[PDB]
Amino acid sequence: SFETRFEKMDNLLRDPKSEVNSDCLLDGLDALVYDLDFPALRKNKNIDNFLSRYKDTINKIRDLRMKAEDYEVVKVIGRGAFGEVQLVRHKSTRKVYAMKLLSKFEMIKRSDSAFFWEERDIMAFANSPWVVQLFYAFQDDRYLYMVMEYMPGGDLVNLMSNYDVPEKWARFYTAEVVLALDAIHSMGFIHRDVKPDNMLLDKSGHLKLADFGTCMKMNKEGMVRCDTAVGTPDYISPEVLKSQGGDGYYGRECDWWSVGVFLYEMLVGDTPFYADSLVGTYSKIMNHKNSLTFPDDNDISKEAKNLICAFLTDREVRLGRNGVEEIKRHLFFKNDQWAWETLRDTVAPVVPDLSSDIDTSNFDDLEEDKGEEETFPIPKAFVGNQLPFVGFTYYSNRRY
Amino acid sequence: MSFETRFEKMDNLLRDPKSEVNSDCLLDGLDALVYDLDFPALRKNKNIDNFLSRYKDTINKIRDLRMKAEDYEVVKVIGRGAFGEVQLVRHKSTRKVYAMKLLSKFEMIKRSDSAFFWEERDIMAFANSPWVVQLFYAFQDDRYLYMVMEYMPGGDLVNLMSNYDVPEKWARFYTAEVVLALDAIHSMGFIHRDVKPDNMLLDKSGHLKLADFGTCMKMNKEGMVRCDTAVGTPDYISPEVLKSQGGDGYYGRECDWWSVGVFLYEMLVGDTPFYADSLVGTYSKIMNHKNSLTFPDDNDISKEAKNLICAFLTDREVRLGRNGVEEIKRHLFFKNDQWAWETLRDTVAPVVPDLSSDIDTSNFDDLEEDKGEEETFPIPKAFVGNQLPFVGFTYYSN
Numbered sequence: 001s002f003e004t005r006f007e008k009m010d011n012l013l014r015d016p017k018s019e020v021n022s023d024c025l026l027d028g029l030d031a032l033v034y035d036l037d038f039p040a041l042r043k044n045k046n047i048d049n050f051l052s053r054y055k056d057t058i059n060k061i062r063d064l065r066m067k068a069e070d071y072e073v074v075k076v077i078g079r080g081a082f083g084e085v086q087l088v089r090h091k092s093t094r095k096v097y098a099m100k101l102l103s104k105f106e107m108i109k110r111s112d113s114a115f116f117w118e119e120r121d122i123m124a125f126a127n128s129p130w131v132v133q134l135f136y137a138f139q140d141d142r143y144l145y146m147v148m149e150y151m152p153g154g155d156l157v158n159l160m161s162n163y164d165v166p167e168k169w170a171r172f173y174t175a176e177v178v179l180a181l182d183a184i185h186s187m188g189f190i191h192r193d194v195k196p197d198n199m200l201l202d203k204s205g206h207l208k209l210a211d212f213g214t215c216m217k218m219n220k221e222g223m224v225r226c227d228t229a230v231g232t233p234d235y236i237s238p239e240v241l242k243s244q245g246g247d248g249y250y251g252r253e254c255d256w257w258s259v260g261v262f263l264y265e266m267l268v269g270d271t272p273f274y275a276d277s278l279v280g281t282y283s284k285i286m287n288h289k290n291s292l293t294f295p296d297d298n299d300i301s302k303e304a305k306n307l308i309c310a311f312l313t314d315r316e317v318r319l320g321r322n323g324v325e326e327i328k329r330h331l332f333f334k335n336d337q338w339a340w341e342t343l344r345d346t347v348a349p350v351v352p353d354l355s356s357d358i359d360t361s362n363f364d365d366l367e368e369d370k371g372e373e374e375t376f377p378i379p380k381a382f383v384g385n386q387l388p389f390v391g392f393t394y395y396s397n398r399r400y
Numbered sequence: 401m402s403f404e405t406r407f408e409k410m411d412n413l414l415r416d417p418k419s420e421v422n423s424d425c426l427l428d429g430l431d432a433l434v435y436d437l438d439f440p441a442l443r444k445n446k447n448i449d450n451f452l453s454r455y456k457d458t459i460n461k462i463r464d465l466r467m468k469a470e471d472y473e474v475v476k477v478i479g480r481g482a483f484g485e486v487q488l489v490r491h492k493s494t495r496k497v498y499a500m501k502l503l504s505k506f507e508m509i510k511r512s513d514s515a516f517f518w519e520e521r522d523i524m525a526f527a528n529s530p531w532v533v534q535l536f537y538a539f540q541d542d543r544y545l546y547m548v549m550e551y552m553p554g555g556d557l558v559n560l561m562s563n564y565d566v567p568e569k570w571a572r573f574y575t576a577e578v579v580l581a582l583d584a585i586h587s588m589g590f591i592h593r594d595v596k597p598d599n600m601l602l603d604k605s606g607h608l609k610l611a612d613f614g615t616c617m618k619m620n621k622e623g624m625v626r627c628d629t630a631v632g633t634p635d636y637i638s639p640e641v642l643k644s645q646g647g648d649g650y651y652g653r654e655c656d657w658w659s660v661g662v663f664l665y666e667m668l669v670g671d672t673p674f675y676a677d678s679l680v681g682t683y684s685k686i687m688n689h690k691n692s693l694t695f696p697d698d699n700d701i702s703k704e705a706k707n708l709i710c711a712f713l714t715d716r717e718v719r720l721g722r723n724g725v726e727e728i729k730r731h732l733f734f735k736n737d738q739w740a741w742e743t744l745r746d747t748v749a750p751v752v753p754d755l756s757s758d759i760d761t762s763n764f765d766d767l768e769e770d771k772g773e774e775e776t777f778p779i780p781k782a783f784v785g786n787q788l789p790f791v792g793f794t795y796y797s798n
């Protein structure tokens with residue numbers, strides 16, 4: 001039908017999940033202009049003409065759409081591999097966010113995943129109190145921008161470095177992690193990188209998972225096929241670590257292993273497979289059957305040691321294989337202060353006391369500054385570097 | 401402006417039919433980018449290869465859903481030549497009858513000239529004037545631009561002049577309707593530059609509309625336009641436009657009034673005032689119009705008619721219409737008792753076409769055939785971007 005066709009097309013331009021919504025189309029144009037405006041390419045008439053035709057229009061668009069200078073950078077609160085995280089205030093709305101910058105050139109400089117799509121999808125549509133929310137996503141010729149809710153409570157790395165975590169706390173945080181991971185699993189993902197760095201606390205001291213670049217969609221049988229290992233040396237499971245070209249076929253039990261490493265670290269103060277060098281940790285993980293020991297410290301309860309050992313075993317006998325319910329029923333979690341279904345409504349073990357909305361005391365003081373770093377080299381022919389990041393913008397077609 | 405304002409200004413832009421960044425135009429850009437990259441030579445680049453692999457499914461569905469050529473049943477070809485052919489079409493679904501104009505992308509590209517269509521699209525789509533042939537839809541594929549216009553069943557003035565020894569009463573009417581049509585174009589801020597019987601079409605009631613605006617240009621601050629470009633059939637072209645061949649000349653709207661004078665002369669005489677066997681011969685006579693413009697020794701043509709023609713066929717500086725259209729309207733030639741300027745298009749036309757059906761094409765000649773094996777673009781070894789000049793052409797009406 002004629003109407004049907006017009007309508008199907010109209011939805012395809014509206015749907016927040018459509019690859020051709022206003023966001024994707026405005027990105028498509030924005031990318032083209034960026035990838036053509038070069039004197040070497042300007043020699044071609046088609047190109048030179050097209051650019052002069054849209055010059056005024058494209059400049060109007062870039063000013064109207066969400067851009068970097070719309071935000072006032074309050075302070076850098078994280079910096080690393082593919083960019084940095086900075087506490088920002090929107091100059092117009094005065095609202096405070098944590099903005100993440102991803103160097104387009106650096107991700108193209110041999111990453112191998114386009115990992116940012118998973119990160120964008122989950123953070124934007126998860127709609128879960130266990131997932132750091134993504135409000136806006138935009139871009140220019142050089143950086144991807146992710147506008148997330150600010151987690152003023154800092155991460156679990158910071159918490160563990162300031163406290164000798166008692167069991168009561170360990171239980172709470174482990175329990176919130178379990179629910180957070182179960183929410184991710186219910187969405188059809190295996191996180192693959194469960195660690196204190198990815199665990200952030202809100203203004204009330206409650207946990208959320210941040211960063212999901214390592215996430216992968218499960219198949220129908222709830223499995224994932226991967227030839228190359230993914231994760232962090234201390235927290236990676238034996239099966240994900242040994243994942244090879246031979247196959248590399250694993251389930252969500254690999255996440256539960258990392259939770260065991262997390263629990264152990266909170267109560268002991270060290271990772272269960274710490275070694276002199278990185279490669280030593282590898283051997284100890286593979287030899288987990290004999291390398292996993294508890295120090296002579298009569299403060300780790302029986303239940304704690306049990307759960308840790310139930311998690312730090314071979315995938316085949318690992319706790320969590322029969323669903324999250326067998327984990328929740330574990331005696332370690334048995335308490336009289338909270339229930340699973342009401343946990344995130346209870347008072348947290350550490351409720352952060354904040355001075356202002358821009359209080360960054362729970363984050364280490366990072367230098368800030370830089371002086372803009374090297375990006376793409378000026379092309380001599382058409383390369384199309386902005387093409388992989390088309391449709392990343394989350395602004396014109398957001399879900400409400 | 402507030403965030404809400406900024407957001408909503410941008411969101412209105414995507415729905416504004418007069419926006420270069422409305423949804424339809426943006427789909428063109430993405431549609432085009434897919435065409436000018438889907439070549440094995442360019443597929444060697446990963447950014448390109450991955451891009452096309454992602455939008456493969458999506459782009460195909462889009463192309464099948466949007467307005468396309470096979471949505472129309474071609475009833476009959478009614479015009480040909482230029483960059484394509486004008487054909488009477490019936491929309492397969494709505495059963496509505498339109499006149500569709502095709503423009504070959506390759507042909508346009510081959511000989512530079514690939515920007516004239518923007519003026520034609522803009523005017524026909526937004527003029528919203530009874531003196532302008534209306535443009536309902538505009539779409540495209542990898543090869544042709546498509547313009548869905550209202551069908552003018554009355555035929556053109558060329559056809560009318562070849563069937564009648566046009567009397568003055570008729571000549572006056574048609575000249576008067578042309579004057580109002582040209583004034584409407586001028587009011588929109590354009591100089592037509594190609595006023596001729598071919599571009600003058602009649603509706604079912606026998607009333608005039610201007611069709612084709614591929615030579616129209618936007619007047620500058622002072623209502624002028626510089627230009628360089630070759631010329632086809634100088635018969636109606638003014639001396640100034642002919643002298644301005646290479647950016648060496650700025651001319652006003654009074655170049656259109658010259659063409660009206662040629663039009664009036666042709667209706668009453670039967671021949672164009674500066675006709676010659678060669679193109680350069682016609683040119684020479686137009687340049688020497690001061691001495692070449694003559695009238696036959698049969699005073700069938702009235703005094704007022706001779707006056708108006710001579711008032712139009714003079715040097716730009718003293719040409720009638722330089723002081724506005726009102727001095728033209730007040731000319732004694734137009735003095736009559738059958739119509740008034742403000743009510744003219746509501747009066748009964750001198751020739752009201754009698755039509756058999758909605759697809760009656762009796763006022764249009766049957767056309768030969770093209771035997772036209774239209775040339776296609778060669779497979780590129782690098783990025784050429786032949787689709788870029790046609791991005792943002794797509795247009796729909798509500």
Ligand SMILES: C[C@@H](N)[C@H]1CC[C@H](C(=O)Nc2ccncc2)CC1
Pocket residue numbers: 077078085098100132148149150151152197198200210211
């Ligand atoms: C170490 C990496 N895996 C990664 C963890 C999450 C971090 C972040 O978004 N932090 C953050 C989010 C919201 N509010 C404050 C900080 C970015 C870096």
Ligand SMILES: C[C@@H](N)[C@H]1CC[C@H](C(=O)Nc2ccncc2)CC1
Pocket residue numbers: 478479486499501533549550551552553598599601611612
């Ligand atoms: C010869 C050229 N200057 C040009 C004249 C007008 C013609 C046309 O659109 N004709 C038309 C319009 C509407 N209905 C029927 C025919 C296209 C070609």
